[PDB]
Design an enzyme around this catalytic site. Structure first.
Site, mmCIF file in Angstrom:
data_model
loop_
_atom_site.group_PDB
_atom_site.id
_atom_site.type_symbol
_atom_site.label_atom_id
_atom_site.label_comp_id
_atom_site.label_asym_id
_atom_site.label_seq_id
_atom_site.Cartn_x
_atom_site.Cartn_y
_atom_site.Cartn_z
ATOM 1 N N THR C 179 0.815 -1.209 0.000
ATOM 2 C CA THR C 179 0.000 0.000 0.000
ATOM 3 C C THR C 179 0.851 1.262 0.000
ATOM 4 O O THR C 179 0.322 2.354 0.244
ATOM 5 C CB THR C 179 -0.955 0.014 1.199
ATOM 6 N N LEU C 252 31.273 -17.352 0.472
ATOM 7 C CA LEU C 252 30.654 -16.199 -0.177
ATOM 8 C C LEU C 252 31.474 -15.703 -1.360
ATOM 9 O O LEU C 252 30.910 -15.189 -2.334
ATOM 10 C CB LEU C 252 30.459 -15.073 0.840
ATOM 11 N N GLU C 254 32.846 -17.394 -3.620
ATOM 12 C CA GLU C 254 32.570 -18.165 -4.827
ATOM 13 C C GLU C 254 31.308 -17.699 -5.547
ATOM 14 O O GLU C 254 31.176 -17.945 -6.751
ATOM 15 C CB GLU C 254 32.472 -19.655 -4.481
#
Ligand SMILES: Nc1nc2c(ncn2[C@@H]2O[C@H](COP(=O)(O)OP(=O)(O)OP(=O)(O)O)[C@@H](O)[C@H]2O)c(=O)[nH]1
Ligand SMILES: Nc1ncnc2c1ncn2[C@@H]1O[C@H](COP(=O)(O)OP(=O)(O)CP(=O)(O)O)[C@@H](O)[C@H]1O
Ligand SMILES: Nc1nc2c(ncn2[C@@H]2O[C@H](COP(=O)(O)OP(=O)(O)O)[C@@H](O)[C@H]2O)c(=O)[nH]1
Ligand SMILES: CCS(=O)(=O)NCc1ccc2c(c1)OCO2
Ligand SMILES: [Ca+2]
Ligand SMILES: [Ca+2]
Ligand SMILES: [Ca+2]
Ligand SMILES: [Mg+2]
Ligand SMILES: [Mg+2]
Ligand SMILES: [Mg+2]
Lengths: 352, 54, 438, 425
Positions: C179, C252, C254
């Site tokens: 919204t 991480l 890789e």
């Protein structure tokens, strides 16, 4: 109430389709930038497909297949045929063509020259035609030097293809011609052929001993009406419809348009569209596509049909707008957004 | 279609399949950005209180 | 073993973090009280699951996670929910009032006051790591905190942990479940100031999750719970290699090597299958080929877009369940002869495949049915630029009128940051076009 | 714990405010004595938003009753729920405001404003985290209009970073007490343009038409008019009073509803509006078709005369949320010419399970529409009709005001109308 937007004011076809939609009192036209539309009669170039199918609660439909340009570009078509196993390099209905880049910029120059030398050595007709997509600029000649030197003068990609030295000539007149077939593909990828074709005939007698004058060799409706002196002599607007051309084939060649020319046309239409279906189909997509296609064919004195090019934004013969446009509304738009025969199309069944 | 660097263990395995070969702002600068916006807020609020005092 | 610290920012990040750490516990056999009977090393161990959980002397396995939200209501569910016992209070940080969907409010006004505290809490977790790999940052694009405070957090993290990788899980705004009208503003502002700080980001379009829950799960009106359980399955598939023994995507580092050859283009497309309703009488188990072929169906992508009209830079297939290389390579041969997989000429046309024999776990009482094999394809496609183009367009419509801009300027942001952020996006779209189109 | 401080000033403000606390107290299960007697935990989930909790589990509204004469507030205290209000939070004088904006803003009101702020400060001090304020008042009189906008000005000075919200009753000659109401409304509107984040515009002329035509009330009374205001105030605050994620905060609402700081005047709507055929079940299509119909709107402006900048619908009761989106998305897609296309997705829907008293389901409408310029146009024309003759000015010049101040309020509102017109195109 269905809503639509118009983003190509130059399209004569969809200009009529928009008029037809508004005539049903069930379609509302919105500003061309209002995203809340059911139907997009979109622009020719750079149509933003990525923005379609993201409005919640709206089934959005567009009149262009994203990716169908591979079929409607001169160089793209040649590459598609040579690279697609469904069409192969030995396809028997497409003139021998090569992709030639101007030297100021892969390219097939050498491959084209070996085939040129092959003809020149074997006494065979060695007349080629060089053309591109940035034309109104076309050249015809029997010397490879003139063909190559012409493309280098330009700056865009071109294609050299074999010129049909033995075309089918209508009598009386002894004049060349091409055949335009309109084909509609809907969201379900049914291939519908419009029962009404048009032969754009050259009002000039064919002349094989002088390609310098491209008035009897090019059957374009714009050239015949600007650079031809016999325009409108044999048929109004250099346009002969199937009813007439069919009667000619009977009285003269003792055959019919269906058997000798149309069976091949329908086969070529199927081959091209089915070939690219996996790449452009919108079956499992968040939006839906349909599109009108203009196929141009050539016919030689042996009644063998050849494919010239495919048009993604074609115009229609004046006498066939209401019928064809209304047909687009019927099977292309109302088939997805229904309203509260004897079809004019020929469905070319195929395996999806 | 080739397989390379196949590694197997107890909980699974992994490999590579090749089809075709080929053809910052410092801490000081962040404090300035943060303090610049804080200053602009202080300016706007003083313009409100100056307006209200009038 | 190297540790991974997860960070959850804003409502979306926190509720997705809740769904993931629930799934992680079911996968590692961890109970709500932090106890893990399979772990024979009490209060210690450098096992694969230890990348995500630390251990106390009493046998409690504590997630290496931090939840941050500028208002406390979403995190209070964590404090009292099923897995309240996993975390200690210092891991759950809540403020008094949120960013009101205002990037400037979360990045500048409120972010300035709470940033040092968050870093202090994160520093505590880092101090438990013998070799911290980096961070995993979950957040939304549209929220004021998710966009505003995240981009600040990433700026500082790059300063305090320069040599550490940072991966994102970002929720792309979808109108069907929001919204907030200003979310295009927040999304573009946060992408600009985060781009140079994020090494790899997996965008999830809520519109895609929504339609998968309606189509494949028969959820007429999916909720955040429905969305987050599906999102945490894709998250588990992506982080599984970090938490289990393996050889592909083991750290991480890789993720960038395998998925991001060009630094700015670090938004891989994710596609998951199969998603099968649990209410079904009984489904036919899909084969390696069928689920692999599904990875090229737009209907199963985390971002609705057409990869047929992009170019690939990388591709990883992460399988879980009854899968062997013989079947994988077979289906790949069949999919090349049918699909439109166009790679960039300066990248090897291939696939890196990882297989984990443990099939996907499903939360009891959840919507997803247990399947024998599932796959998640991480492909770097120019096609995902369609998402930037859409988002960038909505930005252009409102910014042309300066609509809502006063709310941002009022929090201390200069208007020029809008255009500076937008010009950066325009160049990002151009990067994709220069790499993908001809 | 995001508390809201409620202020009601003057006759209209206190009578509308009275019925409001009566309506929402029923919805939250609070009886007239402050003791809770509901059966659903959803009633207490966000109860502290509008109520304080005293000893003995007593819930006391966080409301301050202001007036310059004792009359109306004596009635409140004697009314149905009069006992439920904190006796300290009654602040009143004896002089009256004589339907005079100057008396409320500059003379009588100035003598009383400090004691009102002492009460406002007392309620704020006991707020864990104060969202903002909401004021009920009319603009056509003296206390609510003159002193009300004075209180706003002084509240913004002391709480500059808190949301200021108002329910403002606009005067109309159809339901008029004096001829100076245009003077009072034009003077207030300028104050509100500057010092409010959200003003719900309540036109007594619209309330009349709804009572006469739709509700078939031959001779409507202020009481009848206030039934609609009560029902509308309950609907627009449902987002704040029950568990929800959409427009659940005053500042978040303002952020999604106000694209430009001065254009923050909303048109509210309510459905159903049935005349006593009152037991029939109301379908979702009917709720939506009616909720968007002008006849169901309280600003008395034809929306089809302008464009919606932003819209916020709230559906209450047990119903099909799928069918809610289907009808909402059907209204936008069937009238997209009345929604500005440069604010993507400017229509937002919110559902609530608890329906209002005596109804299976209802819908409240909140529109930031440029059509509202018609209401300000009417006020402007009536102002100028008298001001060009300086008629009735002595009532104001006798309180220290100058003609220049009136000329400025005139230009200020006519600028506001111009600002609306440029965004309608
Ligand atoms: N998938 C998913 N999306 C969510 C969830 N919660 C919120 N969102 C999305 O996030 C966007 C709103 O941002 P939020 O994360 O709620 O806001 P925030 O980060 O808490 O920042 P504030 O403005 O301070 O509240 C909307 O697009 C929502 O659809 C969730 O649990 N799951
Ligand atoms: N290989 C070939 N052999 C014989 N004639 C050829 C030919 N290639 C083109 N032509 C002639 O050129 C005309 C078609 O030209 P082409 O279609 O390539 O240009 P164009 O695309 O600008 C016209 P349009 O797209 O409107 O059909 C036909 O009349 C045809 O007779
Ligand atoms: N809807 C409604 N309007 C009212 C009520 N009482 C007064 N009004 C309107 O408010 C204006 C008069 O202001 P009033 O509140 O009586 O003056 P005040 O007491 O000095 O603030 C006129 O336009 C009246 O029509 C009421 O109870 N309900
Ligand atoms: C024809 C019906 S009515 O005009 O009597 N009802 C509306 C109304 C109510 C109260 C009023 C008023 C007008 O003017 C002052 O107080
Ligand atoms: Ca251990
Ligand atoms: Ca870095
Ligand atoms: Ca006095
Ligand atoms: Mg052409
Ligand atoms: Mg929040
Ligand atoms: Mg009165």
């Amino acid at each position: 109430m269905y809503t639509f937007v118009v983003r190509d004011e130059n399209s004569s076809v969809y200009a009529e389709v928009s008029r037809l939609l508004l005539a049903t009192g069930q379609w509302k036209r919105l500003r061309k930038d209002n995203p809340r539309f059911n139907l997009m009669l979109g622009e020719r170039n750079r149509l933003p497909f990525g923005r379609l199918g993201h409005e919640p609660g709206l089934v959005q439909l567009v009149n262009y297949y994203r990716g169908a340009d591979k079929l409607c570009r001169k160089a793209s078509l040649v590459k598609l045929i040579k690279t697609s196993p469904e069409l192969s390099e030995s396809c028997t209905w497409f003139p021998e063509s090569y992709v030639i880049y101007p030297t100021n910029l892969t390219d097939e120059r050498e491959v084209f020259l070996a085939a040129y030398n092959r003809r020149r050595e074997g006494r065979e007709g060695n007349v080629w035609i060089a053309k591109s997509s940035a034309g109104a600029g076309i050249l015809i000649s029997s010397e490879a030097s003139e063909l190559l030197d012409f493309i280098d003068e330009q700056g865009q990609v071109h294609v050299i293809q074999k010129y049909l030295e033995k075309p089918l000539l209508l009598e009386p007149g002894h004049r060349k011609f091409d055949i335009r077939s309109w084909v509609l593909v809907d969201h379900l990828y049914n291939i519908y052929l419009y029962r009404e074709g048009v032969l754009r005939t050259s009002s000039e007698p064919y002349n094989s001993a002088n390609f310098q004058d491209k008035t009897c060799h090019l059957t374009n409706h714009c050239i015949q009406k600007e650079y031809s002196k016999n325009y409108g002599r044999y048929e109004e607007g250099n346009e002969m419809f199937f009813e007439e051309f069919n009667q000619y084939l009977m009285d003269a060649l003792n055959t019919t348009l269906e058997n000798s020319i149309l069976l091949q046309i329908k086969h070529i239409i199927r081959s091209c569209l089915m070939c690219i279906e996996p790449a452009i189909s919108t079956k499992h997509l968040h939006y839906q596509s349909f599109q009108l296609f203009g196929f141009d064919f050539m016919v030689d004195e042996e009644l063998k049909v050849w494919l010239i090019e495919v048009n993604g934004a074609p115009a229609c013969a004046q006498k066939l707008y209401a019928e064809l446009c209304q047909g687009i509304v019927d099977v292309a738009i109302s088939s997805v957004f229904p309203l509260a025969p004897t079809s004019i199309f020929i469905k070319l069944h195929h395996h999806h | 279609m080739e397989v390379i660097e196949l590694n197997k263990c107890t909980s699974g395995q992994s490999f590579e399949v090749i089809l075709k070969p080929p053809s910052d702002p410092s801490l000081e600068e962040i404090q300035k950005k943060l303090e610049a916006a804080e200053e602009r807020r202080k300016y706007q609020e003083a313009e409100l209180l100056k307006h209200l005092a009038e | 073993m190297r540790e991974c610290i997860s960070i959850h920012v804003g409502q979306a990040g926190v509720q997705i973090g809740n769904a993931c750490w629930e799934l992680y516990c079911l996968e590692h056999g961890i109970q709500p009280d932090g106890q893990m009977p399979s772990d024979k090393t009490i209060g210690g161990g450098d096992d694969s699951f230890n990348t995500f959980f630390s251990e106390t002397g009493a046998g409690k396995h504590v997630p290496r996670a931090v939840f941050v939200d500028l208002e406390p209501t979403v995190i209070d569910e964590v404090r009292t929910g099923t897995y309240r016992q996993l975390f200690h209070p210092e891991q759950l940080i809540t403020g008094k009032e949120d960013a009101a969907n205002n990037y400037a409010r979360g990045h500048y006004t409120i972010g300035k006051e709470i940033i040092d505290l968050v870093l202090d809490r994160i520093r505590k977790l880092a101090d438990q790591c013998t070799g911290l790999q980096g961070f995993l940052v979950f957040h939304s694009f549209g929220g004021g905190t998710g966009s505003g405070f995240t981009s600040l957090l990433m700026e500082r993290l790059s300063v305090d942990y320069g040599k550490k990788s940072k991966l994102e899980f970002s929720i792309y705004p979808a109108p069907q479940v929001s919204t907030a009208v200003v979310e295009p503003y927040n999304s573009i502002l946060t992408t600009h100031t985060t781009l140079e700080h994020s090494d790899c980001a997996f965008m999830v379009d809520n519109e895609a999750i929504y339609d998968i829950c309606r189509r494949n799960l028969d959820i007429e009106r999916p909720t955040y719970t429905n969305l987050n359980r599906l999102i945490s399955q894709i998250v588990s598939s992506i982080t599984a290699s970090l938490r289990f023994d393996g050889a592909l995507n083991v750290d991480l580092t890789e993720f960038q090597t395998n998925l991001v050859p060009y630094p700015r283009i670090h938004f891989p497309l994710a596609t998951y299958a199969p998603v099968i309703s649990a209410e079904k009488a009984y489904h036919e188990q899909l084969s390696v080929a069928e689920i692999t072929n599904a990875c090229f169906e737009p209907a199963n992508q985390m971002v609705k877009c057409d990869p047929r009209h992009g170019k690939y830079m990388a591709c990883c297939l992460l399988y879980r369940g009854d899968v062997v290389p013989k079947d994988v390579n077979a289906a790949i041969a069949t999919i090349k002869t049918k699909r439109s997989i166009q790679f960039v000429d300066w990248c090897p046309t291939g696939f890196k495949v990882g297989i984990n024999y443990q099939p996907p776990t499903v939360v009891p009482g959840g919507d997803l049915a247990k399947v024998q094999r599932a796959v998640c394809m991480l492909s770097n496609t120019t096609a995902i630029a369609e998402a930037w183009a859409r988002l960038d367009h909505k930005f252009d419509l409102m910014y042309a009128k300066r609509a809502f801009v006063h709310w941002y300027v009022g929090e201390g942001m200069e208007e020029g940051e809008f255009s500076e952020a937008r010009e950066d996006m325009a160049a990002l779209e151009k990067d994709y076009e220069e790499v993908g189109v001809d | 714990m995001r508390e809201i401080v409620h202020i009601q000033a003057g006759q209209c403000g206190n009578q509308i405010g009275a019925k409001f606390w009566e309506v929402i107290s029923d919805e939250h299960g609070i009886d007239p004595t402050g003791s809770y007697h509901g059966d659903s935990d959803l009633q207490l989930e966000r109860i502290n938003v509008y109520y304080n909790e005293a000893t003995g589990n007593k819930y006391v509204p966080r409301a301050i009753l202001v007036d310059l004469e004792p009359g109306t507030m004596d009635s409140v205290r004697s009314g149905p729920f009069g006992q439920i209000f904190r006796p300290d939070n009654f602040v009143f004088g004896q002089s009256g405001a004589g339907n005079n904006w100057a008396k409320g803003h500059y003379t009588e009101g100035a003598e009383l404003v400090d004691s009102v702020l002492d009460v406002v400060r007392k309620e704020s001090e006991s707020c864990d985290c104060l969202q903002g304020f909401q004021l009920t008042h009319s603009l056509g009189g003296g206390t609510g209009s003159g002193m009300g906008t004075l209180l706003i000005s002084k509240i913004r000075e002391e709480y500059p970073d808190r949301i200021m919200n108002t329910f403002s009753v606009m005067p109309s000659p159809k339901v008029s007490d004096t001829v100076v109401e245009p003077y009072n409304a034009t003077l207030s509107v300028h104050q509100l343009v500057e010092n409010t984040d959200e003003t719900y515009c309540i036109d007594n002329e619209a309330l009349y038409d709804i009572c006469f035509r739709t509700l078939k009330l031959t001779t409507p009374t202020y009481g009848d008019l206030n039934h609609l205001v009560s029902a509308t105030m309950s609907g627009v605050t449902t987002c704040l009073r029950f568990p929800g994620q959409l427009n659940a905060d005053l500042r978040k609402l303002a952020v999604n509803m106000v694209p430009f700081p001065r254009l923050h005047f909303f048109m509210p709507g309510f459905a159903p509006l049935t005349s006593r055929q009152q037991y029939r079940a109301l379908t979702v299509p009917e709720l939506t078709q009616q909720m968007f119909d002008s006849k169901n709107m309280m600003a008395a402006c034809d929306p089809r005369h302008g464009r919606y900048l932003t819209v916020a619908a709230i559906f209450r009761g047990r119903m099909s949320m799928k069918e809610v989106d289907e009808q909402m998305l059907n209204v936008q897609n069937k009238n997209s010419s009345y929604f500005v296309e440069w604010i993507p997705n400017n229509v937002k829907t919110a559902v609530c399970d608890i329906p209002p008293r005596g109804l299976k389901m209802s819908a409240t409408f909140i529109g930031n529409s440029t059509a509202i310029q018609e209401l300000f146009k009417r006020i402007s024309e009536q102002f100028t009709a008298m001001f060009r003759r300086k008629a009735f000015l002595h009532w104001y010049t006798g309180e220290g005001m100058d003609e220049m101040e009136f000329t400025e309020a005139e230009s200020n509102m006519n600028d506001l109308v111009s600002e609306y017109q440029q965004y309608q195109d």
